[PDB]
Short mmCIF file of C-alpha atoms and ligand atoms in Angstrom, two decimals:
data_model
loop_
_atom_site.label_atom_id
_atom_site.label_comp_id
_atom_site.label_asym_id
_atom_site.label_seq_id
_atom_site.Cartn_x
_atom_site.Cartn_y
_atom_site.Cartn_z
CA UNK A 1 -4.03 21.88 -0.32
CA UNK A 2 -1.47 21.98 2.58
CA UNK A 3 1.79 23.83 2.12
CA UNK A 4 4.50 22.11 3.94
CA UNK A 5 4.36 18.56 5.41
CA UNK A 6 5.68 20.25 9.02
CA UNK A 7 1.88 21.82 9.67
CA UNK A 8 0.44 18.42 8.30
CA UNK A 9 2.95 16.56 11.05
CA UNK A 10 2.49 19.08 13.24
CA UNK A 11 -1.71 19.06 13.25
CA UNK A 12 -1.04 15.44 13.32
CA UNK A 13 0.37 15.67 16.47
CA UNK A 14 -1.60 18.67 18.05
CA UNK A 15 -5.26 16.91 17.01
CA UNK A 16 -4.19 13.05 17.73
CA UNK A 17 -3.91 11.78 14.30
CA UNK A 18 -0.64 10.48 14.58
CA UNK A 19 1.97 10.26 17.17
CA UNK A 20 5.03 9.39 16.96
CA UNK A 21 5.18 5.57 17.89
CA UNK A 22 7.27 4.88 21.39
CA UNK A 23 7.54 8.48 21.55
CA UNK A 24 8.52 8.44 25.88
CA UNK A 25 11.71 6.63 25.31
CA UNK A 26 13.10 7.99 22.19
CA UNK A 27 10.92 7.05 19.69
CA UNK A 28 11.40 4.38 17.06
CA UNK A 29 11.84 6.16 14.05
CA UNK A 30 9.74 4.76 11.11
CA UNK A 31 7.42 3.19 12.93
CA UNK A 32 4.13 5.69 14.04
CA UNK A 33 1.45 5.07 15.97
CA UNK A 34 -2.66 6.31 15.07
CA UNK A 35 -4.52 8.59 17.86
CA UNK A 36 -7.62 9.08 18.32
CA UNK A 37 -8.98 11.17 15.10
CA UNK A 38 -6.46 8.94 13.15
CA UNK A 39 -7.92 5.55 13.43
CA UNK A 40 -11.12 6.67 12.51
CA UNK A 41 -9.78 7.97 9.48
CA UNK A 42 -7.97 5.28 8.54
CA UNK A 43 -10.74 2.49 9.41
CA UNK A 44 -13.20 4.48 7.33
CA UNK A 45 -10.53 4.60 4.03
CA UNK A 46 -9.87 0.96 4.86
CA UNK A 47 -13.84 0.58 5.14
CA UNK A 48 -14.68 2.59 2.22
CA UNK A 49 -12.28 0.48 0.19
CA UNK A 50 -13.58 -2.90 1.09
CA UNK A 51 -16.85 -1.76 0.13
CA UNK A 52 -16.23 -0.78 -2.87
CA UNK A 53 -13.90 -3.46 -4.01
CA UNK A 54 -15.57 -6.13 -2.58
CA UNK A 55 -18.99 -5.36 -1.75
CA UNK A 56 -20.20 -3.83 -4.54
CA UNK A 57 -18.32 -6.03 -6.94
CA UNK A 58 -19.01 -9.35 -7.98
CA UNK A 59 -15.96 -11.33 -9.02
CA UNK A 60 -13.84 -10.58 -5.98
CA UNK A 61 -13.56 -12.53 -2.38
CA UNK A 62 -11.93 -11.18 0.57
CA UNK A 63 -9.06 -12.20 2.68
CA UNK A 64 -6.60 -11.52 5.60
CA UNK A 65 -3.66 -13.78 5.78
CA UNK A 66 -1.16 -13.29 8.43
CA UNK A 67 2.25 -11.45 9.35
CA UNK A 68 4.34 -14.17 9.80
CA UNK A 69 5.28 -15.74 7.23
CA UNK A 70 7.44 -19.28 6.51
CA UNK A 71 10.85 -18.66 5.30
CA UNK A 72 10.42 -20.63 1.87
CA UNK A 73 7.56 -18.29 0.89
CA UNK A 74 9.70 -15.23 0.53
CA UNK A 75 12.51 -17.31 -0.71
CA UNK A 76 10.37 -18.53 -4.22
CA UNK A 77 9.14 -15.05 -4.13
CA UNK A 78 12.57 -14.43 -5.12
CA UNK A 79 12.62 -11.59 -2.19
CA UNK A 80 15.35 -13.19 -0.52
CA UNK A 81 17.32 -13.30 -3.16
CA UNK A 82 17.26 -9.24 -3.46
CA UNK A 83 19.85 -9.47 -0.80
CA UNK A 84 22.31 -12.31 -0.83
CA UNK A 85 25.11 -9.92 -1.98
CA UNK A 86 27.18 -8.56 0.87
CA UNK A 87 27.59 -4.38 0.43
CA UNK A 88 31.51 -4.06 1.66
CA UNK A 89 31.43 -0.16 1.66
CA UNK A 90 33.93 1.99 1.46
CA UNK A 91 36.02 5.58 1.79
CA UNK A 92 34.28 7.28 -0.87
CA UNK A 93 32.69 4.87 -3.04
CA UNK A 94 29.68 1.57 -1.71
CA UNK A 95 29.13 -1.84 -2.38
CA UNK A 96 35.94 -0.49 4.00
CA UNK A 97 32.70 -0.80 6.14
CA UNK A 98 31.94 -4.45 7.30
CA UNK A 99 30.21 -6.66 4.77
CA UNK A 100 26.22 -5.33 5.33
CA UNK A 101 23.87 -7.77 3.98
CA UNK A 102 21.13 -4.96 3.42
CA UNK A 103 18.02 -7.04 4.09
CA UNK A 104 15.09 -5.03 3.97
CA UNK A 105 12.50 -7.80 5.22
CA UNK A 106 12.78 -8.17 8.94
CA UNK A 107 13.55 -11.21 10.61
CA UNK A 108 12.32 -13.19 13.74
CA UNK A 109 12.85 -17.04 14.58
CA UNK A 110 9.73 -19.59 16.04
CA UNK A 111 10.21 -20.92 19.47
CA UNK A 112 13.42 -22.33 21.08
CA UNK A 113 16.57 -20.99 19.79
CA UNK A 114 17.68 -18.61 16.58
CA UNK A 115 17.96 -21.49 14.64
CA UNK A 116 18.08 -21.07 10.75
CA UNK A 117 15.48 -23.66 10.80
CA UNK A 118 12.70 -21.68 12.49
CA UNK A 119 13.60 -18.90 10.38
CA UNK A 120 10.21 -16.29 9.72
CA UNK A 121 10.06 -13.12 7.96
CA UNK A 122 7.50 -10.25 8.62
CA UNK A 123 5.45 -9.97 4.91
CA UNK A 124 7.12 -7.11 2.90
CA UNK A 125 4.04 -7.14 1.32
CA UNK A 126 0.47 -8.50 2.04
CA UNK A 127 0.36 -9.97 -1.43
CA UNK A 128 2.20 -13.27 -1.11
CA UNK A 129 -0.43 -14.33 1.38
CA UNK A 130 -2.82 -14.32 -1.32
CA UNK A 131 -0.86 -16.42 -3.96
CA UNK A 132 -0.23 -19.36 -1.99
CA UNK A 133 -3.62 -19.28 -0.70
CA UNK A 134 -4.91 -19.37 -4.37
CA UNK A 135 -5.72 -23.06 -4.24
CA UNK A 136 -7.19 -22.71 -1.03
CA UNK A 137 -9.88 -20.04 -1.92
CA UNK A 138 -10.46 -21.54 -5.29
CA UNK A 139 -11.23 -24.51 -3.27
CA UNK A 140 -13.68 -22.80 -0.78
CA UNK A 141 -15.62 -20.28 -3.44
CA UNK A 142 -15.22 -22.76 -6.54
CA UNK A 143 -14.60 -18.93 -8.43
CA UNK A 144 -14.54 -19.17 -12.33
CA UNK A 145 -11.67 -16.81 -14.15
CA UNK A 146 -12.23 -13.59 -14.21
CA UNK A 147 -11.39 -12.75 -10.38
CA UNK A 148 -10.02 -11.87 -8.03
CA UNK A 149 -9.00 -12.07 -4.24
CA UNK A 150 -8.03 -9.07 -2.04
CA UNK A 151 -7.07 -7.92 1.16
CA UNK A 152 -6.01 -5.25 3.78
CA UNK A 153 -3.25 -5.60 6.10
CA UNK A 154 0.35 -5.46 8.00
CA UNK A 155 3.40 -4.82 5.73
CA UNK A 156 6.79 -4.46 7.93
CA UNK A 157 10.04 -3.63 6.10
CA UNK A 158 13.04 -2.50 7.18
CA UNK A 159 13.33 0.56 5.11
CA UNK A 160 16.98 1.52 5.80
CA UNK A 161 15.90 5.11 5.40
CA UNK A 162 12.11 6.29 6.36
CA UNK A 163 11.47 9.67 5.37
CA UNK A 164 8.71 12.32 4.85
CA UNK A 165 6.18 11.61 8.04
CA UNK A 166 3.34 8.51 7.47
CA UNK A 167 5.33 8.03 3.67
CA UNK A 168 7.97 5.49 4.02
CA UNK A 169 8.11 4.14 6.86
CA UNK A 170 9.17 1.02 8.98
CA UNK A 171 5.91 -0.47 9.12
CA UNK A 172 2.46 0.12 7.29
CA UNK A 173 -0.67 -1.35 6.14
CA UNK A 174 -1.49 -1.84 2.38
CA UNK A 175 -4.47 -2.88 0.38
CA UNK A 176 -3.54 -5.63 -1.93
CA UNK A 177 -5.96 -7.16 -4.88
CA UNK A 178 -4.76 -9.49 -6.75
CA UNK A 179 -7.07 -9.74 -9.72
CA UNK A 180 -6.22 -13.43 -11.49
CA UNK A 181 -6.68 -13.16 -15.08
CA UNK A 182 -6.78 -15.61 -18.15
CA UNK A 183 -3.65 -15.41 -19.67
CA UNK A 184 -4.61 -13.26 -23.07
CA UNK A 185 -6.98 -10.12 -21.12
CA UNK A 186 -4.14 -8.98 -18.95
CA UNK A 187 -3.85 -5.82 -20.72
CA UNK A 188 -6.98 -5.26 -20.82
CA UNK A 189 -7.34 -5.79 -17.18
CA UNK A 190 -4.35 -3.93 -15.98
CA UNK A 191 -5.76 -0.92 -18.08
CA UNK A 192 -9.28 -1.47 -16.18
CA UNK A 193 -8.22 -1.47 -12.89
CA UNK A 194 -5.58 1.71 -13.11
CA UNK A 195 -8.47 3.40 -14.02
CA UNK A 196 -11.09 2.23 -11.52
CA UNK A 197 -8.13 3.40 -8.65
CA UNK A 198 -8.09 6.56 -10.32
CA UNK A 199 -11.82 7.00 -10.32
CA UNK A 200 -11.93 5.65 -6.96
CA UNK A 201 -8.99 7.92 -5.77
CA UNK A 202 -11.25 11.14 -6.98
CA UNK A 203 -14.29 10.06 -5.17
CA UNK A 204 -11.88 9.65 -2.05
CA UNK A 205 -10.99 13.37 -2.62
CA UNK A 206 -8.07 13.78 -4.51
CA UNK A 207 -8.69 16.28 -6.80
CA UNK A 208 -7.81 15.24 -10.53
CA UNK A 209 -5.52 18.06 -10.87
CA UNK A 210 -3.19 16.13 -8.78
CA UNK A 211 -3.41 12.35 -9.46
CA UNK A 212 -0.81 11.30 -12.27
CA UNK A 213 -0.65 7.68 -13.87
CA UNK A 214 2.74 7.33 -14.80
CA UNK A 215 3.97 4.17 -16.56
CA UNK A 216 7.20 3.07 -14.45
CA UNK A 217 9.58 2.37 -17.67
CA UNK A 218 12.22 -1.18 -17.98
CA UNK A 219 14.29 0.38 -15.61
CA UNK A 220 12.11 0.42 -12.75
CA UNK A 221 9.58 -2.43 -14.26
CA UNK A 222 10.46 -4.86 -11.15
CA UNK A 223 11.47 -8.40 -11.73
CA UNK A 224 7.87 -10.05 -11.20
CA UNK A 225 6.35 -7.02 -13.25
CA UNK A 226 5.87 -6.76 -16.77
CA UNK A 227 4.59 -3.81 -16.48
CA UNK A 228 3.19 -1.33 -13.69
CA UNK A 229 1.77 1.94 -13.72
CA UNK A 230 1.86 4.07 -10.67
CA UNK A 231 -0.84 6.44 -9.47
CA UNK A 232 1.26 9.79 -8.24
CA UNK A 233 0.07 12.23 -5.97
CA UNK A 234 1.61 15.67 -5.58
CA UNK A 235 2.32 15.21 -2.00
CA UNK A 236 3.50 18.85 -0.48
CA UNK A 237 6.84 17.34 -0.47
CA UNK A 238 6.36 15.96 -4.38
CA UNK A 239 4.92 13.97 -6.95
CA UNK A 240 5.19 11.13 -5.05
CA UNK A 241 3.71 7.10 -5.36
CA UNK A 242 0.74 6.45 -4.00
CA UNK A 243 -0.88 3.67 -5.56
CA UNK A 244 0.79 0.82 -7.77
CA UNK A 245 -1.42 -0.58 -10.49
CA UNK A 246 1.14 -3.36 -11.58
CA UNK A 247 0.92 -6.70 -13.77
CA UNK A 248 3.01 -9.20 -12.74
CA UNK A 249 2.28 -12.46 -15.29
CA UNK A 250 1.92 -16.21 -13.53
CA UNK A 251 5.18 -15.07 -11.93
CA UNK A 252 3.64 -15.35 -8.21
CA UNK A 253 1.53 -18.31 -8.84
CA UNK A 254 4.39 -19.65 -11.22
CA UNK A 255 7.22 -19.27 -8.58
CA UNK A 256 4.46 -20.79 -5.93
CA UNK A 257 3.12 -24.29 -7.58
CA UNK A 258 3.86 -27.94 -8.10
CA UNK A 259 4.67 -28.99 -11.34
CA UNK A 260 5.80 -25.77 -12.62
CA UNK A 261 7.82 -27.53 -15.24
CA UNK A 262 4.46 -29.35 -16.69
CA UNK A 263 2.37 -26.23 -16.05
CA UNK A 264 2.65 -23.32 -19.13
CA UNK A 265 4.72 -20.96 -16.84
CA UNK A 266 5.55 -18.13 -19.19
CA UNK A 267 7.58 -16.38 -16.51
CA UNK A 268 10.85 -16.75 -14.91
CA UNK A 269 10.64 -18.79 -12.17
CA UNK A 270 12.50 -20.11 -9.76
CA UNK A 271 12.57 -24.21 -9.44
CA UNK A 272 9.87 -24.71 -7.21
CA UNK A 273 11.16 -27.74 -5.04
CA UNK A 274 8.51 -27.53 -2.48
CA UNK A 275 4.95 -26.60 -2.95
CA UNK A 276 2.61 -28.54 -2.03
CA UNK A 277 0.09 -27.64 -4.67
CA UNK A 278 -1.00 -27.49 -7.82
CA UNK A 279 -1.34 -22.96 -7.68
CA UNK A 280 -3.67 -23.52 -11.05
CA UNK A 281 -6.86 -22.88 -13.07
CA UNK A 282 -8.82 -25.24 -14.93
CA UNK A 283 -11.36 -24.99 -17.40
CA UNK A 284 -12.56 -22.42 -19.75
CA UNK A 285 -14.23 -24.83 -21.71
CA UNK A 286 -11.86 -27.02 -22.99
CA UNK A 287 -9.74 -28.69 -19.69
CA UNK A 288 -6.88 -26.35 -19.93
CA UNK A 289 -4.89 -26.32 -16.66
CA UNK A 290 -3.19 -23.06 -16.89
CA UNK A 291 -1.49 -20.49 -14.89
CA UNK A 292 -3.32 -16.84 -14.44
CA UNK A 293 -1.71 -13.58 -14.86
CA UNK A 294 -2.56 -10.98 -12.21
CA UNK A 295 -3.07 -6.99 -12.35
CA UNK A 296 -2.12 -6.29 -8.59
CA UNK A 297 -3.75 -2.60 -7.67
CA UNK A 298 -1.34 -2.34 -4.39
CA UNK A 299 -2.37 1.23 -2.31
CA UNK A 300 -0.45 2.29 0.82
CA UNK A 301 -3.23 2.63 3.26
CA UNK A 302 -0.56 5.10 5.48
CA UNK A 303 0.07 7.20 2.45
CA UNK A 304 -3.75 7.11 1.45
CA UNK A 305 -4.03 9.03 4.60
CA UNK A 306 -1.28 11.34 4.32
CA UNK A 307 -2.54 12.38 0.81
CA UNK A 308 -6.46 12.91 2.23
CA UNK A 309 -4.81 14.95 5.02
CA UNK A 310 -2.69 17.29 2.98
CA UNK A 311 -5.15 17.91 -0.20
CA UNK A 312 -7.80 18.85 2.32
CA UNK A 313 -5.69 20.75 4.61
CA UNK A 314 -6.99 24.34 3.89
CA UNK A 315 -5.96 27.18 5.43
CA UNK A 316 -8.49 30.06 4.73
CA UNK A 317 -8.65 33.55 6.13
CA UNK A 318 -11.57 34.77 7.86
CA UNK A 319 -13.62 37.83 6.33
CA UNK A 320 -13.51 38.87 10.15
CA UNK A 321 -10.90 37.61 12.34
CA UNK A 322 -7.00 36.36 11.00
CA UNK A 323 -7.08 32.89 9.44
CA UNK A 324 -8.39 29.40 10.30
CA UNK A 325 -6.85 25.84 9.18
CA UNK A 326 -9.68 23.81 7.94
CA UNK A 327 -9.32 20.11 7.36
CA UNK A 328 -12.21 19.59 4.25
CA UNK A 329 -12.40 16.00 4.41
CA UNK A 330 -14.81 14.42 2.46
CA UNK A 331 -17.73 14.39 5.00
CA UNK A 332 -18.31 10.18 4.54
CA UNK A 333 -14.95 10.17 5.73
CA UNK A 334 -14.43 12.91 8.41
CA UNK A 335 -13.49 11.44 12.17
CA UNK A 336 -16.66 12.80 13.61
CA UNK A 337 -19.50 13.35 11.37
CA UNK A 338 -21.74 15.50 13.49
CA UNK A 339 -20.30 17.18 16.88
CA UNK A 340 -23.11 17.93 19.87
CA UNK A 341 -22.15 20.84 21.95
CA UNK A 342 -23.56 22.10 24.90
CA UNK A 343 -23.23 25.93 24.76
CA UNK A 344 -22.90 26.29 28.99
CA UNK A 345 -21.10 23.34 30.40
CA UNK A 346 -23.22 24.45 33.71
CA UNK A 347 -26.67 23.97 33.04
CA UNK A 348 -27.28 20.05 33.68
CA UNK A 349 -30.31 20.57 31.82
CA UNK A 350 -28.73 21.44 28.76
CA UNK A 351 -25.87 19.04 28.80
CA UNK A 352 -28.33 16.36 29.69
CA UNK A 353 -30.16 17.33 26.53
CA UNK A 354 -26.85 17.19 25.24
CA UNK A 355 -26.20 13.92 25.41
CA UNK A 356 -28.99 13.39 24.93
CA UNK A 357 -29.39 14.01 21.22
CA UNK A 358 -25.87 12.61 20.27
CA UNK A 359 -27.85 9.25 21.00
CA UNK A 360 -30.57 10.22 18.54
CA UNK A 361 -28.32 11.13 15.44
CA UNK A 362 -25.66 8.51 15.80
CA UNK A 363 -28.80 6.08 15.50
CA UNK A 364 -29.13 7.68 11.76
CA UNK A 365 -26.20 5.50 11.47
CA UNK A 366 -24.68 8.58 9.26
CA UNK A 367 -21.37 7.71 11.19
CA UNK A 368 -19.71 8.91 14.57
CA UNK A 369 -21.61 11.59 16.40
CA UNK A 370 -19.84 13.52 19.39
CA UNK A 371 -20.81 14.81 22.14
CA UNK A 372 -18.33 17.35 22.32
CA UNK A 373 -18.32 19.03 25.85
CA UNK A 374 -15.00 21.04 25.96
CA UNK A 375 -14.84 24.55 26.91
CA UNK A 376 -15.60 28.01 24.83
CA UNK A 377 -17.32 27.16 21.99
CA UNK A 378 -15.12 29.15 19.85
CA UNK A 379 -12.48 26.24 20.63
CA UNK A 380 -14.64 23.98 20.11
CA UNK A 381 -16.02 24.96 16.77
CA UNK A 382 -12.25 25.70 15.66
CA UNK A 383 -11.17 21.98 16.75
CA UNK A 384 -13.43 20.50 14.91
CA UNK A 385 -12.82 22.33 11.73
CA UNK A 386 -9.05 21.38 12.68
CA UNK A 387 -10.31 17.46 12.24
CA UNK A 388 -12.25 18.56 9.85
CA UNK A 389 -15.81 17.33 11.41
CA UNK A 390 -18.66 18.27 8.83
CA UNK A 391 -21.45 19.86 11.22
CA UNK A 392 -21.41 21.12 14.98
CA UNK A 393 -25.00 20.69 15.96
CA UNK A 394 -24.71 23.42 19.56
CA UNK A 395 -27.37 23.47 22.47
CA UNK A 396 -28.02 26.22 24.39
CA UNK A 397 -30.98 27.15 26.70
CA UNK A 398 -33.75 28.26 24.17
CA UNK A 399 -33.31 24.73 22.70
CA UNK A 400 -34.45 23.31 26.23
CA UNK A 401 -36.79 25.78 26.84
CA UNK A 402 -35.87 28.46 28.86
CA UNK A 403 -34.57 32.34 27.43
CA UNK A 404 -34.18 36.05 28.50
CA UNK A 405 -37.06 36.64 26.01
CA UNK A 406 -39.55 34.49 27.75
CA UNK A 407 -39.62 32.35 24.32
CA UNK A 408 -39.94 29.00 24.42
CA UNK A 409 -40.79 28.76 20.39
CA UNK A 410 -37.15 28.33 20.77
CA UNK A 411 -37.31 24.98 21.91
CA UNK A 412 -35.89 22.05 20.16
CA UNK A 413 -34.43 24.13 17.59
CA UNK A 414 -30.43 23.96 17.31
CA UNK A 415 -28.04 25.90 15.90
CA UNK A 416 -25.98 23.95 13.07
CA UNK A 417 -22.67 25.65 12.25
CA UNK A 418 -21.13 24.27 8.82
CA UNK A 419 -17.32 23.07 8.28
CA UNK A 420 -16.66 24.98 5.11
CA UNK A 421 -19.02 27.94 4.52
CA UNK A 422 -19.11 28.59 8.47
CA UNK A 423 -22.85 29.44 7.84
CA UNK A 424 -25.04 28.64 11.13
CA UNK A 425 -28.49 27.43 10.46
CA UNK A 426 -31.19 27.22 13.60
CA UNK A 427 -33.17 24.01 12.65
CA UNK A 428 -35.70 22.15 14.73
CA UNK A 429 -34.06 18.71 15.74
CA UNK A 430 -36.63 16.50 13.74
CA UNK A 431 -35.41 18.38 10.84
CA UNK A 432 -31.77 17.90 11.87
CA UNK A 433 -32.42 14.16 10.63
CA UNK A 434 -33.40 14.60 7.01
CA UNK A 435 -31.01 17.44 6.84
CA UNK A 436 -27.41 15.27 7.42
CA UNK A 437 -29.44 12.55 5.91
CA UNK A 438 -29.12 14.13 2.82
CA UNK A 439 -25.56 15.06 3.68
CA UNK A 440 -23.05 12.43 4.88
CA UNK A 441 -24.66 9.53 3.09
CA UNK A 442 -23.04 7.66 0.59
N1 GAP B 501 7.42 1.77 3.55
C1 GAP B 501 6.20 2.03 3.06
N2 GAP B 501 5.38 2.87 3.72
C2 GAP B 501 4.15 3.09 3.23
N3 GAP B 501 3.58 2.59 2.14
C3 GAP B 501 4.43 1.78 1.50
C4 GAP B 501 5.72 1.46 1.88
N4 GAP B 501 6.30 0.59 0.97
C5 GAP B 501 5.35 0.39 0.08
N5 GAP B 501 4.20 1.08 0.35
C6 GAP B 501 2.97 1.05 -0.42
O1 GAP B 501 2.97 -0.09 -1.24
C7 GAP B 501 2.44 0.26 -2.52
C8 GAP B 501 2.95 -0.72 -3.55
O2 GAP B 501 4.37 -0.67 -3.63
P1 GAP B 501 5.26 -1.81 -2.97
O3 GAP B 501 6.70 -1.45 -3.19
O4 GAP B 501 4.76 -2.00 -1.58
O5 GAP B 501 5.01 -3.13 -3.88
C9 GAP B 501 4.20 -4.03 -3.52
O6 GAP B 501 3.47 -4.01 -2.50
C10 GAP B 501 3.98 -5.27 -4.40
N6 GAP B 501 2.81 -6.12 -3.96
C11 GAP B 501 2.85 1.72 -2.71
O7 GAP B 501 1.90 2.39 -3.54
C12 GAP B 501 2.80 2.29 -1.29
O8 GAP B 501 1.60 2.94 -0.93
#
């Protein structure tokens, strides 16, 4: 684990995981931008994710709806309701300091003139997008009940307080499934799924020891909600969310659909005078038009990274020298997967051979390979164990041939220096395949 969120920010920073977004002018606070080593990161969780619930699955289609969304949508969602009551604060005491509507979805108008008819709000939350697409995919796939659609994308709210580095924040990406359920299995369902995103969580990395389910209680059960359990992760500032395994019940598709009235809606919902669709199922045998319930696993794709960052954020002490700070990623997810380095940045024979081999081992397709050409080695090495890069494959002469010895038995043998044991093997490059082969796959 990593002991203070400062080192995480501040490796962050110093490796080109994450700067701070519009940092040359000030800075917008709560709003951060990915580097280099981030991205990858974050692509491959984002990847890993969509492979898992998605690929490998079988009752689950994909989708990517976009940012903008039409005024009414939020409004049935009931999120713009959540702030029609003015906040006139106050001397000691709150809701005199001018009448603050506190909006926390932000706000941008379509063409022309800031008209409240062209009226758009940034998604809150990728989720709507799915809901009022329902119809829409149902259409396209023809899916039968048990199902679900999910997706990966832009969330943008106006947090009046982001705190804690890539936690809360401004703006963010989530992964949203919405898995639509016949009525009855809900609980069922919503017990399923928290426990797939645990078991998924753990093969992500986070060790069990600090993932908590924690069943939010009335209080904090959320209007669409009737229940939601929360996946914690002991952050090094807290226990904090990280996932949110909820169940809200026809609420969405309820607050979303025509006929609402003549539809079984269960839930709450607002009078739906617009939609232009019937947001329903069909048949399970009889002709039943009904309205699903959903469990809605909701991760933080931001926070996903913060937690992978800090639980393998290790700071060992060397047997020899003072200490190193060794990111222990979970190889399948590291930025760089194997790093090729030249030992003398002189020799164009070497370097040449080099590059040469980063071609041959990034055609394993075992991920990224990098031809790392930077310096002493001894940076080098330490870098990558600061991005946490499984293996530093290093060429020096004897690989190309030449030596002090006279040896050229040598040749096309490389040195392979290991992330986490620090252990440097000398293997011949054809055996350099079958070796991270057996490594860095899946
Ligand atoms: N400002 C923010 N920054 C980063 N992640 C955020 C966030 N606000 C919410 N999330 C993520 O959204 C997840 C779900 O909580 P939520 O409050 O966003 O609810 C919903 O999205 C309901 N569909 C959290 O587990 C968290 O990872």
């Amino acid at each position: 684990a990593a002991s203070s969120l400062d080192e995480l920010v501040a490796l962050c920073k110093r490796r080109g995981f994450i700067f701070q977004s519009s940092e040359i002018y000030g800075g917008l606070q709560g709003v951060y931008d990915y580097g280099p080593l981030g991205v990858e990161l974050k692509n491959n969780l984002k990847q890993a994710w969509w492979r898992r619930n998605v690929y490998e699955r079988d009752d689950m289609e994909g989708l990517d709806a976009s940012v903008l969304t039409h005024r009414l949508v939020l409004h049935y969602s009931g999120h713009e309701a959540t702030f029609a009551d003015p906040m006139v604060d106050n001397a000691k005491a709150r809701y005199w300091t001018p009448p603050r509507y506190f909006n926390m979805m932000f706000q941008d108008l379509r063409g022309p003139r800031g008209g409240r008819g062209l009226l758009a709000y940034l998604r809150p939350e990728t989720a709507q997008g799915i809901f009022v697409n329902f119809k829409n995919v149902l259409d396209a796939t023809s899916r039968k009940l048990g199902f679900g659609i999910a997706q990966i994308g832009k969330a943008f709210r106006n947090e009046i307080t982001p705190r804690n580095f890539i936690f809360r924040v401004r703006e963010f990406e989530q992964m949203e499934i919405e898995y639509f359920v016949r009525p009855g299995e809900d609980e069922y369902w919503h017990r399923y799924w928290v426990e797939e995103r645990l078991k998924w969580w753990q093969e992500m990395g986070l060790s069990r020891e600090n993932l908590v389910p924690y069943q939010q209680p009335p209080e904090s059960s959320a209007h669409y909600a009737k229940a939601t359990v929360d996946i914690l992760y002991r952050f090094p500032h807290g226990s904090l969310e990280l996932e949110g395994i909820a169940q809200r019940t026809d609420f969405d598709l309820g607050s979303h659909t025509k006929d609402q009235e003549a539809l079984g809606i269960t839930a709450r919902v607002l009078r739906n005078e617009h939609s232009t669709q019937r947001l329903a199922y069909r048949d399970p045998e009889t002709g039943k038009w009904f309205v699903p319930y959903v469990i809605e696993p909701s991760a933080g794709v931001d926070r996903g990274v913060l937690a992978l960052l800090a639980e393998a954020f290790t700071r060992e002490e060397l047997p020899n020298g003072e200490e190193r700070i060794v990111l222990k990623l979970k190889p399948q997810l590291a930025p760089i997967k194997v790093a090729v380095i030249p030992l003398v940045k002189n020799r164009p024979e070497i370097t040449e051979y080099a590059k040469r081999l980063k071609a041959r081992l990034l055609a394993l397709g075992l991920g990224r390979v990098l031809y790392e050409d930077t310096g002493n080695i001894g940076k080098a090495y330490r870098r990558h164990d600061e991005v946490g890069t499984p293996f530093a494959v290093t060429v020096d002469y004897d690989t190309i041939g030449q030596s002090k010895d006279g040896t050229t038995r040598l040749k096309d043998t490389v040195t392979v220096r290991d992330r986490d044991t620090m252990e440097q093997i000398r293997l011949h490059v054809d055996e350099l395949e079958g070796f991270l082969r057996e490594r860095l796959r899946w």
